[PDB]
Ligand binder design. Structure first.
Ligand SMILES: CCCCCCCCCCCCCCC(=O)O
Lengths: 232, 246, 12, 10
């Protein structure tokens, strides 16, 4: 398969990430005022990465060659697990912590002491830990970040088998790379997909958290971020 | 047609063993749990003003029942038993619902879009009646269509469930290692059979599609846990499921 | 806490 | 959905 250019995907990943990557630590999360308030800080991040996720979408093969409404749909049913896979991968660079796109690190301790240790732990164990142990590259990332994008089962899809057709072309392009660049291990391609159920559940658990801080917490939520969460 | 070493062979012999002994046949025993008459009489739904209760009480009873066999089944798993208790619990809690729909898809009639559990026939308006929200209903039948279309041989069914069971990401597991390896074991053994497709009337990325559905079962297990609460008094009837979904 | 579930696992 | 429609266009 050449219809889904692996080169154009690894290139789309490269475009997203900031050219200037500096990292500062975050305060324990005892106070919502400080520049560093764990939860608050994640929300500022996800809002920013919301915009760039859009452009990451575009740069993906055939995504712009879809209806206006098939694009919005796929984002509504993916931005969650898509942004999660982003920082999940980025944070393989460090142990017991999370690298945020604002240029801020977040330690496992700031998590627990902010209430969100349960899920923070789950991301490192099911995502950050796994991608690392398996040495999953940036190309492979974009191929999963893409497969999630093109989710056939998204409800309200004007053309279901259309989105299911692209998610077949990424399956090909990717298995190629996994049997090409990584021929030593057979089931490498399969190992890369095995993390999808875990990310689905994690994505769901993360929505929950987001809904609580909105409808209860004093967590200052922003525009674009806001728009992406609308489902009881 | 790939190999299936001495171990993958034994693995599949115990899967279908304790499986035939508790599931895959239980769908016919659904009638034995007080099934409203119109489930026998397919040529007409439930009269608009008939009480809903009789149907619901039937749902509950068969719902609690399947789970009772998703358990009876796992108790005939040397390995599952091998695990500790705080873990045995958490695994069921994370995949009992998921698994019911797994085995239940085998009674799905793609043509009529209905479940046929012996002399009974369930429809999506029945769900509507029980109280399940239209949207959860759409999503639920959509999943089953998807799943049924793949025409997965029996062993391709018994294995898919195994993966749903043995999941380390489940909240509550303590042997996350001993479980992640078992998962890995299951995941591979299935990868074997799929390739050996004697007859090829299906896809090539069948497995890759399944994993998307295991994630649908994740999206679904969570959506259902909420539904039996939005439905007044339904939760109260199947306390077993209340625990599974606690 | 998980009364009936515990109940069911104990044995055959 | 105001915000998203704009990005997907321009
Ligand atoms: C990991 C702790 C979870 C609690 C808060 C909810 C998180 C889910 C929202 C997606 C996270 C956005 C990531 C931003 C980035 O990596 O740049």
């Amino acid at each position: 398969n050449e219809d889904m250019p692996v080169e154009r995907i690894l290139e789309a990943e490269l475009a997203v990430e900031p050219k200037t990557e500096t990292y500062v630590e975050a305060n324990m999360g005892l106070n919502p005022s400080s520049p560093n308030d764990p939860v608050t800080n994640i929300c500022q991040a996800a809002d920013k990465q919301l915009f760039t996720l859009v452009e990451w979408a575009k740069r993906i093969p055939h995504f712009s060659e879809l209806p206006l409404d098939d694009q919005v749909i796929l984002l509504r049913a993916g931005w969650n697990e898509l942004l999660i896979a982003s920082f999940s991968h980025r944070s393989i660079a460090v142990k017991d912590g999370i690298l945020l796109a604002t240029g801020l690190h977040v330690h496992r301790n700031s998590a627990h002491s902010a209430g969100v240790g349960a899920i923070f732990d789950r991301v490192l164990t099911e995502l950050v830990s796994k991608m690392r142990d398996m040495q999953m590259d940036k190309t492979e990332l974009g191929c999963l970040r893409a497969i999630v994008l093109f989710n056939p089962d998204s409800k309200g899809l004007s053309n279901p088998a259309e989105v299911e057709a692209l998610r077949e072309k990424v399956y090909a392009s990717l298995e190629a790379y996994c049997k090409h660049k990584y021929p030593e291990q057979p089931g490498r391609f399969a190992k890369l997909l095995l993390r999808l159920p875990a990310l689905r559940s994690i994505g769901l658990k993360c929505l929950e958290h987001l809904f609580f801080f909105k409808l209860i917490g004093d967590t200052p939520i922003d525009t674009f971020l806001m728009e992406m969460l609308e489902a009881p | 047609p790939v190999q299936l070493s001495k171990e993958q062979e034994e693995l599949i012999r115990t899967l279908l063993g304790a499986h035939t002994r508790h599931m895959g046949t239980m769908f016919e025993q659904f009638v034995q749990f007080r099934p409203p008459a119109h489930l026998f009489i397919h040529h007409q739904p439930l009269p608009t003003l008939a009480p809903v209760l009789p149907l619901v009480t039937h749902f509950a009873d068969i719902n609690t029942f399947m789970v009772l066999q998703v358990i009876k089944f796992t108790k005939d798993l040397p390995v599952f038993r091998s695990l500790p208790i705080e873990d045995q619990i958490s695994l069921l809690k994370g995949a009992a619902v998921e698994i019911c729909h797994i085995v239940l898809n085998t009674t799905f009639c793609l043509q009529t879009q209905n479940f046929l559990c012996g002399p009974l026939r369930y429809t999506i308006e029945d769900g509507a009646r029980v109280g399940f929200q239209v949207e959860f209903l759409e999503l639920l039948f959509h999943f089953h269509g998807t799943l049924r279309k793949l025409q997965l041989q029996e062993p391709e069914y018994v294995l898919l469930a195994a993966m749903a069971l043995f999941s380390p990401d489940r909240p509550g597991v303590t042997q996350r290692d001993e479980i992640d390896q078992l998962q890995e074991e299951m995941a591979l053994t299935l990868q074997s059979y799929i390739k050996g497709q004697q007859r090829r009337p299906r896809d090539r990325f069948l497995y890759a599609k399944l994993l998307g559905l295991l994630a649908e079962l994740r999206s679904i297990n969570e959506a259902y846990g909420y539904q039996i609460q939005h439905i007044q008094g339904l939760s109260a009837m199947m306390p077993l499921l209340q625990e599974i979904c606690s | 806490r998980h009364k009936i579930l515990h109940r069911l696992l104990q044995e055959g």
